[model samples]
Target: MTAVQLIVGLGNPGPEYDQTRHNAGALFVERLAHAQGVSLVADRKYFGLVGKFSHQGKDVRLLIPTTYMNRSGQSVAALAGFFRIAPDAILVAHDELDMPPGVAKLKTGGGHGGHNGLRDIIAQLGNQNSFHRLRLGIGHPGHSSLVSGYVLGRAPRSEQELLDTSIDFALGVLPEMLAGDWTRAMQKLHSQKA
Candidate 1:
């Protein structure tokens, strides 16, 4: 079953990084936690904000790594290891440089595809790539060299709204995700237009 026990959102922690495109995944965790009426508090144990809540009677935990994006695995591993959460039982939400805003997708077992955060997560998980992923699209900078500035920079207001809408759509299908109904979850999320 794909019912995840923990969800990790990868982001660089700081007010400056808060609104950046790279924080898309972390932003999703915040939005999900907020919508669930859960408060995430700074927890040194997990090296990030941590909170636990239930959805459709399934207990789950949410994490937002406070470490910089490159070192995200430190926090994720801390929580996952301590809680004995397997790779398959965790979902990582992160930004996608390939897709534009207003798109989000679910996936499992693949290479990092040049995403350093995913790279680190894979390394920390004993080189395992079986964990689920929530790929949030934030569009890309035309030139490869501009990617650094692009992801760290805030999206335009309109674009941000589109990204938010995508997360809203994913959130709508979260219960199916939590229930291990990946097929249905994918269908519902993919069918929606952000």
Candidate 2:
């Protein structure tokens, strides 16, 4: 039941990456912000776009690093370290190749599983891997070599709809998550089929 203070989304910066499969996490945060009627403004200090939302008298920050995906940890470390937010208090949302589209999972503390963004975060945190991850599955390309191009490209319209539904579901459980109601949140999210 770790309290999640910061929700960071991993993606390469620039218009080129927008709407790509690899930007699913970033898209989640953006949609979340939009629903809250807030804007994620660029903050050079954090090297990213950041927005804050209040819930039950506390602030839950949302971050989308402007740095390339491979260097995401730099922005994360800057913001989290400055605020004294522990690893356990942060949740990173990123695309997952192992799972198919419309699937999402939440868990804490694990290997990067070949995600460059997560790898950099681990390295920046003194090799610690204690943070949480909201894995948004974008499916695989059916071959190893095609992964790079696949993720950076757009998904079919049908698959995009599924991903949107998954993101909406994730958004629905966010308050429970931020409140540290891990059991209820996990149960609700896991009970739904992607």
Candidate 3:
């Protein structure tokens, strides 16, 4: 509920991690699966839940890693290898600390912001950084040392509302994103205020 991280990419499973701020990325993927009428099935080999779809003559996949965020690369590697997906074709969505809740952005081929999840994903992708990313903002705590524990905490109910609205806006522009029209996607997303 806080401004941006949708708790979508956090690793720890079970009800314990449910609704936590870090799972924002995962939550978005789940919602997308529902809308597309695709089931996200757990794959042992991939070490995550995977859903696949085809849109506008493009193949799209949703992968949410089950391992801790620190080891997120393994899951990415497994699925990418099996599917023969290239780094440039992948989009890794994650919880972002820089922005407040209700803010989401899409960017490609950038540093991982020292994030272990993306760092590992970069290495697993043959040290490549060509992949795209969707950042779901979860406000940063004032103290740098508090980050690890902070991301795992759940948001207030009211803040969740903000996050929900942001996701809706992001979802609305997904067609543009999938069609490789990132400028249009960002235009719609950035111009709107949740």
TM-score of each: 0.96, 0.96, 0.90
Distance from true location, Cα of 113 in model 1, Å: 1.1
- Determine the C-alpha RMSD for candidate 3 after optimal superposition of all C-alphas: 5.1
TM-score of 2: 0.96
Q: What's the C-alpha lDDT at position 141 in model 3?
A: 87
Clashing pairs for model 2 are none
How do the residues 1-194 of candidate 3 rate in per-residue lDDT, one tens digit apiece? 01111112434577888888878877878777787898888889988887777765556777888887778888888888887777766767778889888898888788889678889988887898877778888889899899888888998988788777877787898767666676777888888787
> What's the C-alpha lDDT at position 91 in model 2?
87
Clashes found in each candidate (C-alpha, N, C closer than 3 A) = 0, 0, 18
Worst 10 residues of 1 by lDDT: 51-60
**TM-score, cand. 1 vs. native:** 0.96
Q: Write the per-residue lDDT of candidate 2 for residues 1-194, one digit (tens) a residue.
A: 56778999888887888899989889888888888887899999999999897877767899999999999999999998888888888889999999888888888888899889999999998888998888898999899999899999989998998899899989989878898776788899977786
* lDDT on C-alpha atoms for all candidate structures: 0.90, 0.89, 0.76
